[PDB]
Amino acid sequence: KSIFYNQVGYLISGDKRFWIQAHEPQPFALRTPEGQAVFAGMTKPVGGNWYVGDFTALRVPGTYTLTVGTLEARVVIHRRAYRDVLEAMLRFFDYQLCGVVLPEDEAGPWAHGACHTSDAKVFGTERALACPGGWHDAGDYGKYTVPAAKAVADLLLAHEYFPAALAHVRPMRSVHRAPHLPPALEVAREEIAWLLTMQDPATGGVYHKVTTPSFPPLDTRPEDDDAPLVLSPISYAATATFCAAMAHAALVYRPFDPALSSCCADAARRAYAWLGAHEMQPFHNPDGILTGEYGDAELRDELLWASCALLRMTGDSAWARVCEPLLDLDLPWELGWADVALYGVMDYLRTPRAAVSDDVRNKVKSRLLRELDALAAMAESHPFGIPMRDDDFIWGSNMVLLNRAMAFLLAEGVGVLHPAAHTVAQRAADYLFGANPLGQCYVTGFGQRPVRHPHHRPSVADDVDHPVPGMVVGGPNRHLQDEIARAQLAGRPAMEAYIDHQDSYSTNEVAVYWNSPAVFVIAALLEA
What amino acid positions are annotated as catalytic residues? 455, 500, 509
Residues in contact with Zn ion, counted by CB under 5 A, come to a total of 3
- Pairwise CA distance, residues 53 & 66, whole Å: 10
Asked whether residue 116 is marked as a ligand-binding residue, the answer is yes
CB of 115 to Zn ion, least distance (A): 3
Asked whether residue 330 is marked as a ligand-binding residue, the answer is no
Task: Choose among Ca ion, Zn ion, none what residue 241 binds, the Cβ cut-off being 5 to 8 Å by kind.
Answer: none
464 binds Ca ion (CB under 5 A): yes
Residues in contact with Ca ion, counted by CB under 5 A, come to a total of 6
Binding mask 294-323 for Ca ion (x = CB under 5 A): --x-x--x----------------------
Asked whether residue 451 is marked as a ligand-binding residue, the answer is no
Choose the binding region for Zn ion from 107-115, 175-183, 344-352, 382-390 (rule: CB under 5 A).
107-115
468 binds Zn ion (CB under 5 A): no
Asked whether residue 338 is marked as a ligand-binding residue, the answer is yes
CB of 101 to Zn ion, least distance (A): 11
- Phi, psi (deg, nearest 5) at residue 28: -140, 155
- Pairwise CA distance, residues 19 & 3, whole Å: 6
CB of 452 to Ca ion, least distance (A): 9
238 binds Zn ion (CB under 5 A): no
Choose the binding region for Zn ion from 116-124, 203-211, 237-245, 314-322 (rule: CB under 5 A).
116-124
8 A C-beta contact, residue 80 and residue 168: yes
Instruction: List the beta bridge partners of residue 399.
Output: none
Q: Which residue is nearest to Zn ion (CB)?
A: 98
The upper half-sphere exposure of residue 198, i.e. CA atoms within 13 Å in the direction of its Cβ, equals 36
**CA terminus-to-terminus distance, the chain:** 35
Q: Supply the DSSP string of 126-173, one letter for each residue.
A: S-EE----SB--BSS--EEHHHHHHHHHHHHHHHHH-HHHHHT----G
CB of 340 to Ca ion, least distance (A): 6
- Pairwise CA distance, residues 157 & 252, whole Å: 9
Choose the binding region for Zn ion from 87-95, 114-122, 289-297, 345-353 (rule: CB under 5 A).
114-122
Task: Choose among Ca ion, Zn ion, none what residue 298 binds, the Cβ cut-off being 5 to 8 Å by kind.
Answer: Ca ion
- Pairwise CA distance, residues 230 & 218, whole Å: 20
- Pairwise CA distance, residues 48 & 383, whole Å: 8
CB of 294 to Ca ion, least distance (A): 11
| DSSP-derived secondary structure letter, 178 | S
* Among residues 116, 208, 422, 501, the one that binds Zn ion under rule CB under 5 A: 116
Asked whether residue 459 is marked as a ligand-binding residue, the answer is yes
CB of 209 to Ca ion, least distance (A): 16
Asked whether residue 54 is marked as a ligand-binding residue, the answer is no
Asked whether residue 60 is marked as a ligand-binding residue, the answer is no
CB of 249 to Zn ion, least distance (A): 22
Instruction: Using the minimum distance from each CB to Ca ion, give the nearer residue, 191 or 296.
Output: 296
Could you say which residues in the range 217-236 bind Zn ion, by CB under 5 A?
none
Asked whether residue 136 is marked as a ligand-binding residue, the answer is yes
Give the residue from 121, 153, 110, 115 showing the smallest Cα distance to 134.
115
Q: How many CB atoms lie within 10 A of CB 77?
A: 20
Largest CA distance in the chain: 74
Q: How many CB atoms lie within 10 A of CB 79?
A: 13
* Among residues 11, 66, 77, 98, the one that binds Zn ion under rule CB under 5 A: 98
Q: How many residues does the chain have?
A: 528
Choose the binding region for Zn ion from 115-123, 173-181, 199-207, 267-275 (rule: CB under 5 A).
115-123
For the sheet with 62-68, list strands across it.
Answer: 37-42, 27-31, 62-68, 71-77
The helix/strand/coil state of 394 is coil
8 A C-beta contact, residue 303 and residue 340: no
Choose the binding region for Ca ion from 66-74, 115-123, 180-188, 288-296 (rule: CB under 5 A).
288-296
Task: Choose among Ca ion, Zn ion, none what residue 116 binds, the Cβ cut-off being 5 to 8 Å by kind.
Answer: Zn ion
- Pairwise CA distance, residues 423 & 405, whole Å: 9
209's enclosing H/E stretch is: strand 207-211
Task: Choose among Ca ion, Zn ion, none what residue 71 binds, the Cβ cut-off being 5 to 8 Å by kind.
Answer: none
Q: Gaps after which residues in the chain, C–N over 2.5 Å? A: none
CB of 225 to Zn ion, least distance (A): 7
Task: Choose among Zn ion, Ca ion, none what residue 464 binds, the Cβ cut-off being 5 to 8 Å by kind.
Answer: Ca ion
- Pairwise CA distance, residues 1 & 21, whole Å: 8
Instruction: List the beta bridge partners of residue 27.
Output: 42
Asked whether residue 301 is marked as a ligand-binding residue, the answer is yes
- Pairwise CA distance, residues 358 & 19, whole Å: 45
Instruction: Using the minimum distance from each CB to Ca ion, give the nearer residue, 190 or 296.
Output: 296
Task: Choose among Zn ion, Ca ion, none what residue 351 binds, the Cβ cut-off being 5 to 8 Å by kind.
Answer: none
CB-based burial, 276-315: b 16+ in 10 Å, e otherwise: eebeeeebebeeebebbbbebeebebbbbbbbbbbbbbbe
CB of 302 to Zn ion, least distance (A): 27
Q: How many CB atoms lie within 10 A of CB 468?
A: 23
Choose the binding region for Zn ion from 84-92, 109-117, 163-171, 348-356 (rule: CB under 5 A).
109-117
8 A C-beta contact, residue 431 and residue 401: yes
Instruction: Using the minimum distance from each CB to Ca ion, give the nearer residue, 266 or 298.
Output: 298
* Among residues 100, 115, 172, 526, the one that binds Zn ion under rule CB under 5 A: 115
| Interface contacts to Zn ion, rule CB under 5 A | 98, 115-116
| Interface contacts to Ca ion, rule CB under 5 A | 296, 298, 301, 459, 462, 464
Which segments are annotated as binding site for Zn(2+)?
Answer: 98, 115-116, 136
Which segments are annotated as binding site for Ca(2+)?
Answer: 296, 298, 301-302, 338, 459, 462, 464
